[PDB]
Ligand binder design. Sequence first.
Ligand code: SAM
Ligand code: ZN
Ligand code: ZN
Ligand code: ZN
Length: 213
Amino acid sequence: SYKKIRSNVYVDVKPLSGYEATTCNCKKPDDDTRKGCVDDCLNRMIFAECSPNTCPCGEQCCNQRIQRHEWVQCLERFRAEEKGWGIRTKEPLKAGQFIIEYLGEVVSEQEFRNRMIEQYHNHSDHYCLNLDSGMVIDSYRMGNEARFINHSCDPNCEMQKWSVNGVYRIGLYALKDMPAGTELTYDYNFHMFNVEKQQLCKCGFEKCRGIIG
Ligand SMILES: C[S@@+](CC[C@H](N)C(=O)[O-])C[C@H]1O[C@@H](n2cnc3c(N)ncnc32)[C@H](O)[C@@H]1O
Ligand SMILES: [Zn+2]
Ligand SMILES: [Zn+2]
Ligand SMILES: [Zn+2]
């Protein structure tokens, strides 16, 4: 239970990326149906999204996925085995594919530490990612479906920090091909803000670490 938000809620923090000037030099394809900025793209290489009114490809550019909230419509919440409630795809997914933005409240470290002590006592789950410079996307109360995605020691998805119009935002990308019905997973230890509490890992993998965080 949470409020669904279409976009992040900025509380007491602004996660400015520091860089702004972005022009591709990767060129428009003549076909309307063929995508513009692919793996060559200068901006994509530094994990920055193109700006629509400056990009050499304009509307052909597929390096604006967060900006344009170009999420996938497969995602389905389901009764996960031992893990509670998880999320899978009804449709096959290819590697490198943008899946969903991770949404929530953007809060400072002290604001989150406050919320942890003041409000998130005797809580069995942990809904938040490190963003930047000790800023946190908290999704305990507000967020999207990306909050139901479980941990794996062997993940098929990955949280990527992007500069979008001067602002850092986190997007979920596939690491491998995934067929219909398969649950989405990522490695928490990377992104999850270090909390004193530890949890047994039920990801069910040969070389499972046995612990989360
Ligand atoms: C961000 S929530 C994920 C959604 C959660 N499954 C639910 O039902 O709301 C993280 C919590 O899910 C559970 N969880 C996620 N991955 C797990 C795993 N690999 N093994 C056991 N529990 C897991 C843990 O209780 C963890 O605190
Ligand atoms: Zn480009
Ligand atoms: Zn572009
Ligand atoms: Zn594991």
